[PDB]
Amino acid sequence: KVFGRCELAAAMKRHGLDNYRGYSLGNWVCAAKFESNFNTQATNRNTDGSTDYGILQINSRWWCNDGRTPGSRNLCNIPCSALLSSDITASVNCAKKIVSDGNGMNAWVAWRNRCKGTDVQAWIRGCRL
Ligand SMILES: [Pt+2]
Ligand SMILES: [Pt+2]
């Protein structure tokens, strides 16, 4: 599923991400834009042989099992294919673990390089939230 911008803002807000660990909703919307283009089916291989999955590009090195990342962890206790559903619940729940691990949103490279320090409230402009 390719979300619209305000559609995704409303789903993320409903699932408790607005101000989660102090990160406003716009930071999450901005991260999803630049990680996946709002596409729940997005997959991208990493150099180490891991893969990032879903609307928030969660990495099989640590967070999910994809059957082809040997020696990795599964800290969200899920198959990585759960992160590709039209339903973002599994991605949101896993993201809450990630952001709480001490590194905050800096785990998302696209957030760090494209969102951090910018006017992220623009990402929720015009939405009825
Ligand atoms: Pt939820
Ligand atoms: Pt660790």
Side-chain angles (χ1 to χ4, degrees):
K1 171 174 169 85
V2 182
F3 276 79
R5 174 180 64 86
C6 294
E7 186 186 14
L8 184 61
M12 283 180 155
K13 182 170 193 163
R14 175 163 61 81
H15 283 290
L17 277 183
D18 189 18
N19 316 316
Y20 190 88
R21 297 286 305 218
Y23 292 93
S24 65
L25 187 58
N27 278 288
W28 297 104
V29 174
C30 185
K33 170 69 178 179
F34 296 130
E35 291 289 356
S36 65
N37 212 17
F38 305 147
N39 183 9
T40 65
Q41 300 194 66
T43 64
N44 293 109
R45 197 75 183 260
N46 300 135
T47 64
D48 67 2
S50 67
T51 302
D52 288 354
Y53 295 86
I55 200 144
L56 285 170
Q57 290 292 281
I58 290 169
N59 192 345
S60 65
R61 178 61 52 202
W62 306 102
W63 301 107
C64 63
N65 189 331
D66 63 5
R68 63 168 204 201
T69 311
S72 72
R73 302 274 253 127
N74 182 5
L75 293 166
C76 293
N77 236 294
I78 52 166
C80 298
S81 65
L83 303 170
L84 301 178
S85 176
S86 56
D87 178 347
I88 70 169
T89 302
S91 283
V92 169
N93 285 348
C94 189
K96 287 177 176 177
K97 189 183 193 311
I98 298 173
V99 76
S100 302
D101 81 358
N103 298 313
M105 289 193 75
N106 293 300
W108 285 279
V109 166
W111 179 83
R112 193 169 76 219
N113 287 329
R114 306 180 73 176
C115 304
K116 185 179 187 176
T118 72
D119 179 19
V120 294
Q121 189 275 334
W123 288 94
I124 68 162
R125 71 106 192 303
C127 305
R128 305 187 182 104
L129 255 15

Coordinates of all heavy atoms in Angstrom, one line a residue, residues 14-16 89 92-93 96, ligand 1:
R14 N -2.9 7.5 15.4 CA -3.8 6.5 16.0 C -3.0 5.4 16.8 O -3.5 5.0 17.8 CB -4.7 5.9 15.0 CG -5.6 4.8 15.6 CD -6.7 4.5 14.7 NE -6.2 4.0 13.4 CZ -5.8 2.8 13.1 NH1 -5.9 1.8 14.0 NH2 -5.4 2.5 11.9
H15 N -1.9 5.0 16.2 CA -1.1 3.9 16.8 C 0.0 4.5 17.8 O 0.8 3.7 18.3 CB -0.3 3.1 15.7 CG -1.2 2.2 15.0 ND1 -1.6 1.1 15.6 CD2 -1.7 2.2 13.7 CE1 -2.4 0.4 14.6 NE2 -2.4 1.1 13.5
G16 N -0.1 5.7 18.2 CA 0.6 6.3 19.4 C 2.0 6.8 19.0 O 2.8 6.9 20.0
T89 N 0.6 -1.7 11.9 CA 0.7 -1.9 13.3 C 2.1 -2.6 13.7 O 2.7 -2.1 14.6 CB -0.4 -2.9 13.8 OG1 -1.7 -2.3 13.5 CG2 -0.3 -3.2 15.2
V92 N 4.9 0.0 13.4 CA 4.9 1.0 14.5 C 5.4 0.4 15.8 O 6.2 1.0 16.5 CB 3.5 1.6 14.6 CG1 3.4 2.4 15.9 CG2 3.1 2.4 13.4
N93 N 4.8 -0.8 16.1 CA 5.2 -1.5 17.4 C 6.7 -1.7 17.4 O 7.4 -1.5 18.5 CB 4.4 -2.7 17.6 CG 3.0 -2.4 18.0 OD1 2.7 -1.3 18.3 ND2 2.2 -3.4 17.8
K96 N 8.7 1.6 17.8 CA 8.7 2.1 19.2 C 9.9 1.4 20.0 O 10.6 2.1 20.8 CB 7.4 1.7 19.9 CG 6.3 2.6 19.4 CD 4.9 2.2 20.0 CE 3.8 3.2 19.6 NZ 2.5 2.7 20.2
Ligands
PT1 PT -1.4 0.7 17.5

